[PDB]
Amino acid sequence: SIQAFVFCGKGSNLAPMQHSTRLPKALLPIGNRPMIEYVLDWCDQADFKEISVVAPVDEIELIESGLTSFLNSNHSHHLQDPKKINFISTGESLQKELLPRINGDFVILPCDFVTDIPPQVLVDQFRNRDDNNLAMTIYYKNSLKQQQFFTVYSEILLDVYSQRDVTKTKYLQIRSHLLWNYPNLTVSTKLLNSFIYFCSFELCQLLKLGPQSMSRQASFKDPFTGNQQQQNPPTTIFILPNETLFIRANNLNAYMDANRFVLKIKS
Amino acid sequence: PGISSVIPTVLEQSFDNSSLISVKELLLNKDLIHPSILLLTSHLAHYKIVGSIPRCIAMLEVFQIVIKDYQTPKGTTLSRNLTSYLSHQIDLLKKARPLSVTMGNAIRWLKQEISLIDPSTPDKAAKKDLCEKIGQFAKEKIELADQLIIDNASTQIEESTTIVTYGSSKVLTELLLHNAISLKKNIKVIVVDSRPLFEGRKMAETLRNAGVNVMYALITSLDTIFNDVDYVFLGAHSILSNGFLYSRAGTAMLAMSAKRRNIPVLVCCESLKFSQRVQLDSVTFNELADPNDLVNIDYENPVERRGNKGALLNQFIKERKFEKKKLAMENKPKGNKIGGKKGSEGESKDASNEE
Amino acid sequence: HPNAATSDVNVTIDTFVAKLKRRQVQGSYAIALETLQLLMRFISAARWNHVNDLIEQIRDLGNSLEKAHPTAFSCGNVIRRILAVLRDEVEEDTMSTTVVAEPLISSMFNLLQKPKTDYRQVAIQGIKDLIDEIKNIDEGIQQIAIDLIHDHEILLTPTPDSKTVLKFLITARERSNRTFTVLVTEGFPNNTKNAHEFAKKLAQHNIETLVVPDSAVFALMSRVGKVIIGTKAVFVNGGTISSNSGVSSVCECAREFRTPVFAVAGLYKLSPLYPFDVEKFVEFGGSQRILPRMDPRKRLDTVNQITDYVPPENIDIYITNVGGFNPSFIYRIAWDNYKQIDVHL
Amino acid sequence: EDRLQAVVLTDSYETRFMPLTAVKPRCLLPLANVPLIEYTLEFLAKAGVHEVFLICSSHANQINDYIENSKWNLPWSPFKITTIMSPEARCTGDVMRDLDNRGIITGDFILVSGDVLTNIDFSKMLEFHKKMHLQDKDHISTMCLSKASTYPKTRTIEPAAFVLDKSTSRCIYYQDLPLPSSREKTSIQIDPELLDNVDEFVIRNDLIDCRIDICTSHVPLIFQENFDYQSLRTDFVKGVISSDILGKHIYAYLTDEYAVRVESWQTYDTISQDFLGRWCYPLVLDSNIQDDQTYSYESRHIYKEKDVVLAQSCKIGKCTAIGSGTKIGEGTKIENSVIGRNCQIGENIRIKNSFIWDDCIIGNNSIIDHSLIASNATLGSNVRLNDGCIIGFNVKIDDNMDLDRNTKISASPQDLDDQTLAVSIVGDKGV
């Protein structure tokens, strides 16, 4: 009924520490408290019993050791290593592999996290509002160019379109059928997606018959398009994505943000 | 078990017959609690749609699911801790929000069933026949009863009828729908609704979705539509062995008005809604929710606004209480239609021995 | 007579009309004040010397105003009062100009059988008198009100809006030893904000507040002691039109459970027109403040009314500056300041 | 903020109303008995205008007459009306240019494009406009918006698009798409020059069209400077925004209250229906603004004026209105309809969401389901119609008729079907 999957990889995007042979992505002490400490705390808070961490080809026992020693844990965590990983796919290929182990509804939570939010309320929202998928976006750093853009609603709070700025045509484009049902659609500049994902019971059917997703974003939320043609078989409650906004200073790490997180932590 | 007490709102000098709050947002739940019960509790806490009849059905379904999920342990027998579990569940329900007479009856029946089958029969074969029998019971003491109610209504209700109601009683909705589309007639159906809930509104919506001419009504002026109105059903919940109706909202007022102006008021019921417990006023046993339901400026339900309202302790003493369940009278609801077909509420327990 | 001279002769007639029609004006008292001011303006600049003609003109003016708005009556009433004031004076004057007693103040059979001065100054004074009356009704109601409230008694108050009623309540509350608890219905469509304001005011003084849903009166009435209203319009056979929402059902409940019903009243607020049907006098309300969005409105039919009418079968006393009077009697009071001729203008 | 002057656009979108307009024009027409410019005039009065400019062109004489008959040619009000002359069927730029040539205004002025029925208090808006102006010099005009009637699925012809701001509230873009009638275009392209200067963005498509502007002393000069502009919404404001004058901003404002501009038949019908419901509060028939109207609110959602006569045994529905001087025999099964002042009826009218205008004579027997009858257009015997039908001026409909959906009916004594002279779609006679 209640399970969580913990994504782990390798520091491909980070610049100046991660290229050393014995230090992993999961175990990174950047601001005193460890990177997977916070995740573990979150999991504990979330009342989730059985949690399994997905591990890459690099580091197989180090993560296990981390899970075991130093740390409160008191839970039956299991560290599993599937073989189909190439990175050129971060976690989609792992997700595709682990599917008969999912008995209920699963939650996706990467190893690299910075958190300050009240966490119960996301879970509760996921449970209540009869929704298949829900994600999170949080404010840009407020302390003293080309960026990223997301779609939002404010009355129900829904998501529709999620595309960035790296690989697209120069002018901004909107579809016709993707407005005539669900009229009001607001676009925001400031928001940073924390990459936290929730998944319902009926999702396992698609990843064993026809894969398309890249970096866990492509064929997940945007294939909600039940308009124009109707040519991809849907699994029945309609295919609908959701999103919620929060205020506190905590976000994703991808670029030069680690050094800023250091500055943040001591408060 | 969890967290109890430590909550806002005063004891209230006016009306304190039952306690007022509980568990809404989940943390540190026991490692044996079935999720269906939890979800139901979450629903009921902020529920719009259900009231009396469907709730019981839902509960039954949940119980059936639990039974399906349950198997006889190696150490403890089939009747060892089941009863305890049931009791715990009931206590949780009570903590969440007080319950109905039908529910109690169902619980009693379950208990009886527990006793009936001896702890020696094959375990797989036991629950096989159990779930069948429960299903049968559900069919008979709800669906069959509903059918019977419908048929009762059919013989009595005239060629072309204007029907005025209050609430969200599913039976009545079904009846209305039947009249609209199945047997086919002219139906001017008027529904009334209060401030905190939107039951009436929901019913109207449903009727629209089936295609009916509806009038949407409120408290401030009922009379303006009567002064014409010919036939009226009330929001049935529970009958006592006096001959009254423990029911929802200012239905009593409406009934009084009906009594004053020409026509009797009538009610349909299920032959398991009846109690054997009794009371006689809107002070006896009050059903309460939080005074937070009326802070927001109306229109919709989830809004979040800034204005003036939001004082339960801030200003110099401010109590903003209400009621959900009140007393409907006796001399006026002459009509009752059940699983035993006919009778008066003056004949308050003439089917309670017949069962 | 139409509005042909009455535009440049007097300044703000059009503005007054606008206020009436489009409801720029707020408060019955305020309306009355405005009417008085208009009358003053009419008097001051314009000259007549001929009296009956003038009276007729005034009647016509009043009539037109009344016809402009079929549920605001204060304006009409003030005018009627002024007419009455004038008429008696005129009658007195006639008897001096030319140069029998009745069993009481007025006879009945005189209607079937055949029966320069400082008058302008007197007329001026009349308006001033009226103004003063309007100002200090409460200083005349005050010591008639604190004659019927006791200790350990629950007091119901639907439709609490006016500055009069509030003041009355405050005066009672000043004698804090007199024990009374206040139940206040919110009043669904329009009264809500006003009710809240009233509650706040009560709290300010230290008066015990209980906020009531309108559906829930049957559950409270058996515990309710005395009920006070603060009406807008008072009528012939005893009933009232009160400032919006939840009064009819309440009254019915009271009748059923037998409950005492006070009403704060004023004779200038009292109308001598008889209400005969629900089909006319009851004023309806806006669906705008019920449900947003208009595509569900295609099939359903929302029914709502602002201000409501009361049958006299229920209320029992009218606490005025003069005194508390019986509903099946108040006609006499009205006639002690109004006529049978000044009705259908 | 005292002393105000306004420019009003009546006569704009004829032929858009296709069955009507031949002798009597577009803006003069009634809603439920009452003409449409009257509401605009009332609004103007409420605002506090002292100098009124109005445009007349097509069927202009009658409009002028009606204006004269209205109570504003008399100097009792703070304002007077004057007529601007222009050629038959024109755009809005020419008129602007003409006005500029004439040259009167000193400060802030108003332009009301189209036909607007607004119940909204505007003093506060004016104050806000003033405050905004006091912020910075290079600032022009104010624009109004509102949350739509539920979901835009019945309102098909208007697909208005707006891209706005939170902090200062500023728009750039506008777009139109048909969709469920003919599925074609699926692409819109957006301005990428200036974005991080503003930061906050709110994009909305489900907003009600009104077409109103509070304007400062810049617009006519601008029009003079760039004479390529044709309309204000489609080209002008957008052009101004797109680096025309460096640093020149405009204003956006939201109000949840009911305010709709009319343009089509179904929209008009919807507006009528809304009015029938108590959606409008500073505008109801019992208040009687004209001082010659004597309508009052009644039970079961029916409107009535003084003196209405009917014959015995009846059956009535909801959201209806019956005017003064209506002489009705036995019948009328009334559901959702307008009938104007003075309507003589023989016997029986089965009414299911119908419509009847000023002064109509209906003969014997008619089954009517969602259709409109115009002024003086007399109905003979046996009238049977279907959905969305529209009848024009002076249509002397005679004996025996059958028509279905979308069948438009003429007005002239030129292009369309159902002729005004003897028998319509049972004989070809007329001009």
**SS3 per residue for C216-227:** CCCCCHHHCCEE
SS3 label, residue B42: helix
SS3 label, residue B65: helix
The encoded tokens of residue D107 equal 């400060």
CA distance A128 to A125: 5
D120: left (phi over 0), alpha (psi -120 to 50) or beta: beta
D389 beta partners = D371
Residues 297-316 of B with CB under 8 A from A: 302
The verdict on a CB contact (< 8 Å) between A187 and D185 is no
Given CA atoms D244, D250, D256, D259 in this order, what sign does their dihedral have?
negative
A158 beta partners = A242
Residue A192 to chain D, least CA–CA distance (Å)? 14
Largest CA distance in chain B: 71
Which chain D residues have a beta carbon less than 8 Å from that of C297? 273-274, 277, 279
The encoded tokens of residue C141 equal 């109601």
Residues 229-268 of C with CB under 8 A from B: 245-246, 248-249, 252-253, 256
Are β-strands D295-297 and D302-305 bridged in parallel, bridged antiparallel, or unpaired? Answer: antiparallel
Which chain D residues have a beta carbon less than 8 Å from that of A179? 205
Residue B174 to chain D, least CA–CA distance (Å)? 25
Which value, to the nearest 10 degrees, does the dihedral of the CA atoms of residues D19, D20, D26, D31 take? Answer: -90
Q: Is C213 on the interface with B (CB under 8 A)?
A: yes
Sheet holding A241-246, edge to edge: A192-193, A133-138, A241-246
CA distance D254 to B99: 46
The encoded tokens of residue B240 equal 């006592």
CA distance C12 to C35: 11
Q: At what angle do helices C51-68 and C28-45 cross, to 10 degrees?
A: 150
Q: Which domains does chain C have, with CATH numbers?
A: 9-135 (1.20.120.420), 137-336 (3.40.50.10470)
Q: Which of A180, A178, A156, A155 is nearest to A224 (CA)?
A: A178
Q: Which of C222, C278, C301 sits opposite B216 (nearest CB)?
A: C301
CA distance C247 to B250: 14
The verdict on a CB contact (< 8 Å) between C217 and B323 is no
> What length is written for chain D?
431
Which value, to the nearest 10 degrees, does the dihedral of the CA atoms of residues B135, B141, B143, B149 take? Answer: 170
- In sequence order, what are the residues at sequence separation of 6 or more whose Cβ sits closer than 8 angstroms to the Cβ of residue B324? B248, B249, B287, B288, B289
Which chain A residues have a beta carbon less than 8 Å from that of D187? 173-176
H or E stretch covering C133? helix C119-135
Residue C343 CB-half CA count within 13 A: 11
Which chain D residues have a beta carbon less than 8 Å from that of C278? 299
Which chain D residues have a beta carbon less than 8 Å from that of A176? 177, 179, 183, 185-187
The encoded tokens of residue C331 equal 């006609």
Q: Which of C300, C295, D300 is nearest to B210 (CA)?
A: C300
Q: Rounded to whole angstroms, what are the CA distances from B246 to B236, B239, D150, D252, D301? A: 8, 6, 38, 54, 35
CA distance B354 to B349: 9
| Chain C residue at shortest CA distance from B248 | C215
Chains interfacing with D (3 or more CB pairs < 8 Å): A, B, C
The encoded tokens of residue D243 equal 């680096």
Residue D276 in contact with residue D319, Cβ under 8 Å? yes
Going by the DSSP 8-state scheme, the letter that residue A86 receives in this structure is -
Residue D309 in contact with residue D325, Cβ under 8 Å? no
Residue with tokens 């449900």: C291
SS3 label, residue B191: strand
Name the method of structure determination. cryo-EM
* Terminal-residue alpha carbon distance, chain D: 54
Residues B173, B174, B179, CA angle at the centre, nearest 5°?
Answer: 100
Chain interruptions in chain A, by residue before each (C–N > 2.5 Å): 16, 71, 88, 144, 155, 236
Buried/exposed code over D194-233 (b: 16+ C-beta within 10 A; e: otherwise)? eeeeeeebbbbbbbbbbbbbbbeeebbebbeeeeebeebe
- In sequence order, what are the residues at sequence separation of 6 or more whose Cβ sits closer than 8 angstroms to the Cβ of residue B297? B303, B305, B307, B309, C192
The encoded tokens of residue A54 equal 């997905």
Question: Is A117 exposed, middle or buried (CB count within 10 Å of its CB: 0-12, 13-18, 19+)?
Answer: middle
Residue A82 to chain B, least CA–CA distance (Å)? 30
- In sequence order, what are the residues at sequence separation of 6 or more whose Cβ sits closer than 8 angstroms to the Cβ of residue C165? C157, C228, C230, C264
In single-letter form, the type of residue at position C32 comes to A
CA distance D389 to D137: 52
CA distance C251 to C249: 5
CA distance B267 to B328: 11
Q: Rounded to whole angstroms, what are the CA distances from C47 to C41, C44, C120, C124, D170? A: 11, 8, 10, 13, 59
Residues D285, D288, D289, CA angle at the centre, nearest 5°?
Answer: 120
The encoded tokens of residue A155 equal 């009355």
Going by the DSSP 8-state scheme, the letter that residue B319 receives in this structure is B
Residue C214 in contact with residue B193, Cβ under 8 Å? no
Which chain C residues have a beta carbon less than 8 Å from that of B318? 199, 203, 209, 211
SS3 label, residue C162: coil
- In sequence order, what are the residues at sequence separation of 6 or more whose Cβ sits closer than 8 angstroms to the Cβ of residue B232? B163, B164, B165, B254, B258, B263, B265, B266
Residue B151 to chain A, least CA–CA distance (Å)? 35
- In sequence order, what are the residues at sequence separation of 6 or more whose Cβ sits closer than 8 angstroms to the Cβ of residue B89? B37
SS3 label, residue A164: coil
B185: left (phi over 0), alpha (psi -120 to 50) or beta: beta
Q: Is B29 on the interface with A (CB under 8 A)?
A: yes
Which chain D residues have a beta carbon less than 8 Å from that of B186? none
SS3 label, residue A243: strand
B24 beta partners = none
Task: Write the secondary structure of chain D as one string of H (helix), E (strand) and C (coil).
Answer: CCCEEEEEECCCCCCCCCCCCCCCCCCCCECCCCECHHHHHHHHHHHCEEEEEEEECCCHHHHHHHHHHCCCCCCCCCCCEEEEECCCCCCHHHHHHHHHHHCCCCCCEEEEECCEEECCCCHHHHHHHHHHHHHCCCEEEEEEECECCCCCCCCCCCCCCEEECCCCCCCCCCCCCCCCCCCCCCCCEECCCCCCCCCCCEEECCECCCCEEEECCCHHHHHHHCCCCCCHHHHHHHHHHCCCCCCCEEEEEECCCCEEECCCHHHHHHHHHHHHCCCCCCCCCCCCCCCCCCEEECCCCEEEECCCECCCCCEECCCEEECCCCEECCCCEECCCEECCCCCEEEEEEEECCEECCCCCEEEEEEEECEEECCCCCECEEEEECCCEECCCCCCCCEEEECCCCCECCCCCCCCCCCCCCCCCCCCCCC
Residue C14 to chain D, least CA–CA distance (Å)? 8
Radius of gyration, alpha carbons of chain B? 22
Q: Rounded to whole angstroms, what are the CA distances from D253 to A185, B158, C179? A: 19, 55, 52
Give backbone dihedrals phi and psi of B267, rounded to 5 degrees, phi first: -140, 135
**DSSP assignments along C41-90, one per residue:** HHHHH-----HHHHHHHHHHHHHHHHHH-SS--HHHHHHHHHHHHHHHHH
| Chain B residue at shortest CA distance from D315 | B228
Count other C-beta atoms under 10 Å from residue B91's C-beta.
Answer: 11
Residue with tokens 């006026």: B332
Residue D200 in contact with residue D165, Cβ under 8 Å? yes
Query: From the DSSP assignment, how many helices (H) and strands (E) are in chain C?
Result: 11, 11
Residue D81 in contact with residue D66, Cβ under 8 Å? no
| Chain A residue at shortest CA distance from B43 | A128
| Given resolution (angstroms) | 10.4
Q: Which of B224, D370, D283 is nearest to C298 (CA)?
A: D370
Residue with tokens 């199945």: B182
CA distance D425 to D430: 12
Largest CA distance in chain C: 76
Residues C20, C25, C30, CA angle at the centre, nearest 5°?
Answer: 110
Largest CA distance in chain D: 73
Which chain D residues have a beta carbon less than 8 Å from that of B224? 299
The encoded tokens of residue A19 equal 């290229």
Q: Rounded to whole angstroms, what are the CA distances from D123 to B206, C12, C22, D46? A: 42, 20, 15, 9
D261 beta partners = D116
- In sequence order, what are the residues at sequence separation of 6 or more whose Cβ sits closer than 8 angstroms to the Cβ of residue C34? C16, C19, C25, C75
Residue B351 in contact with residue B343, Cβ under 8 Å? yes
CA distance A251 to C28: 60
Question: Is A158 exposed, middle or buried (CB count within 10 Å of its CB: 0-12, 13-18, 19+)?
Answer: buried
H or E stretch covering C93? helix C74-98
- CATH homologous superfamily for the domain D5-276: Spore Coat Polysaccharide Biosynthesis Protein SpsA; Chain A (3.90.550.10)
CA distance D392 to D405: 16
The verdict on a CB contact (< 8 Å) between B28 and A124 is no
Scanning chain B, the segments in alpha helix (DSSP H) are 35-45, 53-69, 82-96, 101-116, 123-138, 145-156, 170-177, 199-210, 223-226, 251-260
Question: Could you state, in order of their start, the residue ranges of all structural domains in chain A?
Answer: 1-267
Determine which of D147, D154, D188 to mutate to test the interface with A (most A C-beta atoms within 10 Å): D188
CA distance D164 to D171: 4
| Chain C residue at shortest CA distance from B204 | C300
SS3 label, residue C301: strand
Q: Which of A171, A176, A189 sits opposite D190 (nearest CB)?
A: A171
Q: Rounded to whole angstroms, what are the CA distances from A117 to A106, A138, A193, B153? A: 20, 10, 14, 56
CA distance D359 to D344: 8
Given CA atoms B311, B313, B318, B321 in this order, what sign does their dihedral have?
positive
CA distance D193 to D202: 17
Q: Which of B169, B192, B151, B200 is nearest to B50 (CA)?
A: B169
Residue D3 CB-half CA count within 13 A: 3
Scanning C146-258, the segments in alpha helix (DSSP H) are 163-174, 191-205, 248-257
Which chain C residues have a beta carbon less than 8 Å from that of D296? 70, 280
SS3 label, residue C32: helix
Residue D385 in contact with residue D368, Cβ under 8 Å? yes
Residue A211 to chain D, least CA–CA distance (Å)? 27
The encoded tokens of residue B235 equal 């929001």
Give backbone dihedrals phi and psi of B48, rounded to 5 degrees, phi first: -100, -55
- Decide: C and A in contact? Rule: 3+ Cβ pairs under 8 Å: no
Determine which of B219, B279, B285 to mutate to test the interface with C (most C C-beta atoms within 10 Å): B219
The encoded tokens of residue C84 equal 């009455």
Count other C-beta atoms under 10 Å from residue D36's C-beta.
Answer: 19
Q: Which of C20, B224, C279 is nearest to D296 (CA)?
A: C279
H or E stretch covering B327? strand B325-328
Determine which of A47, A49, A76, A121 to mutate to test the interface with B (most B C-beta atoms within 10 Å): A47
CA distance B126 to B133: 11
Given CA atoms A7, A10, A15, A21 in this order, what sign does their dihedral have?
positive
Give percent helix, percent strand, percent coil of chain A, each to the nearest 5.
20, 15, 65
Scanning chain A, the segments in alpha helix (DSSP H) are 35-45, 62-68, 92-97, 120-128, 177-180, 218-221, 258-265
- In sequence order, what are the residues at sequence separation of 6 or more whose Cβ sits closer than 8 angstroms to the Cβ of residue D371? D354, D355, D385, D386, D387, D388, D389, D390, D391
